[PDB]
Symmetry: D2
């Protein structure tokens, strides 16, 4: 039987996730049955079909009326309430809530979905506090079916952690620094406007904007051996999607760039197939739009100095690739619902 | 005895207005004494000083504490309440509110400032109805001191209406179409997101976005004889400030491009000095950042066909030039208080 | 027996044209057999496959060696000589040259291809004089096989001329002004640099840039009755592809917006099918990437004042849609070889 | 007596340099007397006055005729020849050539200026081959007056080397990785077009573009102790000016972020005053336009892991700050002309 899903927050990730599910609907243990959003179903149907980044959805017809979005005849019920406690999850028989609003990342916030009637909550962001965090391909097999609130970490964590895991098991990471040169996101301001983060306050398509990255802390949650050994920052720049992370590690076992690349290549073919992609091509960010991998190693940029200082560089589609992983984590939870 | 001014909404217009006043406060009848905004004074002082468009504010020191923003020893008290009826306008002795939030453009909405204790309200946008509308240099001398709620119209109206007035008196405008190729504004979305306007919902730095312009209706409000005779649209494009309006008019007196430019040039040196600037230079939008005129006629682009089809093109700094006009209108109101 | 085609200048138009032909070569009288360009085949094959605007070419494999580009087993010989008189057109048996460099738009310049051995030349731009100019769907059926050098006009001409033809036959165009809000092109400068046009010299991704449009003169070449009756300008803006043209016409037969849209809609379903698309959707420039029509009327923007002042607005993919028309014109030439 | 200067290549650096000299002309041992460029004096006068990045030059009047650019009455002779061997350096009595074309970075290329009559050549880029390289504040005091061709390195080298010098003398750098997130430059393509570097070929304002950085090699030329111990890459992003370099070093003496910041702060006040600026402010790239320092340490982003892995982040205005340093190096050469 299907696990019935509701999306809370039909934004960039909510809509990417919906389009991921629509293209994989023939193999899914999931049925998306409901949406809660600040907007209305006609507005949300329009944004679902006409996407500046993904192009026009062509696989099936998208329409809407007062109460539902329809995608190839599949009816998705729509509601509009900013307080999750008031949501009709009990009545709709909602099993799993995809929490993609950005404002309910704490256990107390996400739990409002549980008291409204949902069984589990999957937060599409690092969790605030005591929330189990998962990266598919790194630690999702340690998922415990008894856990009712989980986090899928961040886009940068999903790109960096699979690579860090491979490098750590091969060379032993002792300390590591990360910088992600990162597309702007809706958390930033179009023009200078108030924000809790004084740099994210600034005109996003006009500036290089230093800010924090969830990966600085979250990679050590999904690779517990490395807790407290990694740190780094983000630089937001004026592209609308696709990001690249630079990672510099102090390693225990001496190596060279050829060996580093070969270890990641072998992983991308076996243990990390479909999570890591290995590329020797001389591409740029536009070329990785729509890529399904969590991280694409840019093998031409790998450098090693003095044996023990390793630099790798990996691309990721922070909207679509991350959403593919949200879907993967939800399918895993559906398989181990017990 | 100064007119005491509060700013409601310390946004792009609110802060451009503040920097305009700070540069002109030697010959001013206004004293900015308070600010209401969704944010705190330390954040707002940071944004007042560091502006991606205007650059770093040079003239005076800008600091803040929990209570005030300080601009070269001048203290501006701050408060943060979304409901204008709660504002301390009586206790602060506020005379005039600059209503720059974009959300109180109806008479009942702006009148909340009067029940809080202010005497008059100047809305930095077209009013939603039954609110007198003024354009400095076009009809502001019809301002009547008995009007306690007024509108300064929109940026496009302030650029187009001076030129329309000049053209109408010289040639007789029978009909006219406008299109402004317009920088994006905070009303638009950084990435595709819900909006009451399905095109303003779309990623603003990625797209040419057709939408409405206030000038289409408001020019005929400040030039009553042209009521119903003008129409047009806006195309929002991926620049963060400075816009250009294209106006095609059906006129009664047959003319040619050279005479049209002579008529506007003569006016820019006399009746419209400081409102219309006449330019024969081959410049682009960046060169007009910070220009004080309401309208810069690009004379090289003027064209006339068959005597009666006239096309003119004018630049405007929609943030700074408009804010200069807000200040001019507030000074005029302060001069005609009773 | 195919018409053997070489491309001179493997640029944006040259490569869009190639990808157009590759997608249509099943029902084609053309065979692209050669390329001349300033660059080498390995670089040009890379750019043919990896396109920041069109995305990664999907249909066939693209490879290269020192001598050729290979597109799914079809070999395209490559050469690199800036002087067309030296090209191996005789030895390669070239029939038709697609002249897409932008530097041989005069008859003497394009005729260098004939002395190198080609039989006919199709210039992907307005000609510099005494070169017949065609717009598919407007006057291409007047093409005479005796003409060995022809012009496909410009992107803006191909968008505006079909709509002008429809409007002129229905209402009688007396005069008309155009403004295209136009994506930047390779002719412009990335950062301020010398140019024969002092505004195209200015940083293209930073500025709104007024400049000339070929449509101003060329529409009257493909619709001779309108010679001298039309004029206008372009505003280049910081988007990399897709443009929109705004056309205000003085017409003889009084009309209203609803009738104007009905006249264009009826034509888009009959005489202009596949050239004009009629759209009542609320879309933005990104949604028209890859559209095959020459002109997409945005019906919601149509306006009429006083019966005789008509405004219409039409989208066009200036790279891809124009290249589809280049291909259409080359097919037509191939069909009428003698 | 003055050292007479000619600029070869009146581009972004050539014109920034000219404007640097104009603002410091009251203390200079240099007289700019000549310009060679691909363009004409009227075009170059226009670009000198109207700059998309620097704004309109206001300090003095800029005009031109057929032969000269005039800047506040100072006449600069203009010539236009792509081959330096043909330039009139002998006749004009040119002492020093500022070589800013980007195409004469080898000794054999730059020497053509010497055979045309110039005494010395200062290349505004890393030199190709056997050319002494200087960073002001790092090694310019080792300049030998007998050297007739010198290099000022690159923008990134001038930002990174002063910091590396400070950190090395304080903590002992053993190995180090750099990534500069860098504004696009005129070497990149506005839209996808052929380039010797397949990534710089791609649309610059649309992409994150990995490429090489001159600093990877040049920092070890100006700090000879570190030759072969540093490496790194550049990521070009869609901003038109201002860059930021991230530097991760393995150091010998254990430290912490507080100490790293304090060492650079002390340097910025003493040995590196005017080369390094120390900032604790939460700014973004737009805020560093026009900054005169070679590097602005962003102190809030400094991190240290495990004692010996240090990360620092520094801003730089790659056009204006680098040009200030070109001017400084030219003044130094003028002081030690002997
Ligand atoms: N965009 C990315 O690259 C990315 C990648 C990984 C994770 N994330 C995370 O996913 C979450 C969503 O990010 P996004 O980029 O989609 O943002 P977004 O702003 O596009 O989406 C948020 C959506 O939630 C809606 N919303 C806001 N408050 C609500 C409430 N109280 N109730 C219901 N709906 C509400 C908004 O209207 C919007 O549709 C954030 O936590 C973000 O950190 C984003
Ligand atoms: N930006 C322009 O070019 C321009 C030109 C002319 C007129 N306008 C008009 O000026 C007004 C403001 O535009 P802007 O571009 O400065 O927008 P903005 O979003 O930059 O500024 C609005 C400010 O009001 C604050 N705010 C919102 N709701 C509030 C409330 N209930 N109480 C207090 N503060 C609140 C916001 O936090 C923000 O600081 C709008 O009416 C707009 O149409 C804008
Ligand atoms: N880009 C558009 O939207 C568009 C639309 C319609 C028409 N056009 C016209 O198409 C033509 C090409 O425009 P584009 O945008 O593709 O420009 P582009 O700069 O991308 O392409 C020109 C190509 O020609 C090559 N080239 C230059 N000189 C050459 C020579 N002497 N010999 C061989 N190759 C040479 C260049 O390297 C480049 O590959 C121009 O005439 C332009 O006006 C462009
Ligand atoms: N822009 C930066 O951030 C930056 C910073 C440091 C160093 N540089 C270096 O400075 C040099 C110039 O770079 P730019 O950004 O000013 O490039 P640019 O393209 O703006 O300037 C080059 C100038 O030289 C002219 N030119 C080209 N070939 C010529 C020839 N044979 N003879 C005479 N003039 C010729 C061009 O017309 C142009 O005006 C390059 O070597 C670059 O690496 C650039
Ligand atoms: Mg007439
Ligand atoms: Mg009429």
């Amino acid at each position: 039987s299907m696990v019935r899903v509701a999306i809370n927050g039909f934004g960039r990730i909510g809509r990417n996730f919906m389009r991921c599910w629509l293209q994989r609907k023939a193999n899914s243990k999931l049925e998306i049955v409901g949406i809660n959003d600040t907007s209305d179903p006609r507005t949300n149907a329009h944004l679902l079909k006409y996407d500046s980044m993904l192009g026009i959805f062509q696989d099936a017809e998208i329409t809407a009326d007062d109460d539902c979005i329809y995608a190839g005849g599949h009816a998705v019920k729509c509601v509009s309430d900013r307080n999750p406690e008031n949501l009709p999850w009990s009545a709709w028989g909602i099993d799993l809530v995809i929490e993609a609003t950005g404002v309910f990342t704490s256990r107390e916030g996400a739990s409002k979905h549980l008291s409204a009637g949902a069984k589990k909550v999957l937060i599409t962001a690092p969790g605030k506090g005591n929330i189990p965090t998962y990266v598919v391909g790194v630690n999702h097999h340690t998922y415990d079916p008894s856990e009712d609130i989980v986090s899928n970490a961040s886009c940068t964590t999903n790109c960096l952690a699979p690579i860090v895991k491979v490098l750590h098991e091969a060379f032993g990471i002792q300390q590591g620094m990360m910088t992600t040169t990162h597309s702007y996101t809706g958390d930033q301001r179009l023009l200078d406007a108030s924000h809790r983060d004084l740099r994210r306050a600034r005109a996003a398509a006009m500036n290089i904007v230093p800010t924090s990255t969830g990966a600085a802390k979250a990679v050590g949650l999904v690779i517990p051996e490395l807790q407290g050994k990694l740190n780094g920052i983000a630089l937001r720049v004026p592209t609308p999607n696709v990001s690249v992370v630079d990672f510099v590690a102090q390693v225990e076992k001496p190596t060279i760039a050829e060996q580093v690349n070969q270890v990641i290549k072998e992983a991308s073919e076996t243990t990390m197939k479909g999570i890591i992609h290995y590329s020797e091509l001389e591409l740029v960010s536009s070329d990785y739009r729509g890529h399904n991998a969590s991280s694409i190693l840019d093998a031409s940029l790998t450098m090693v100095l003095g044996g023990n200082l390793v630099k790798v560089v990996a691309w990721y589609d922070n909207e679509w690739g991350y959403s593919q992983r949200v879907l993967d984590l939800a399918e895993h939870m559906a398989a181990h619902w017990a």
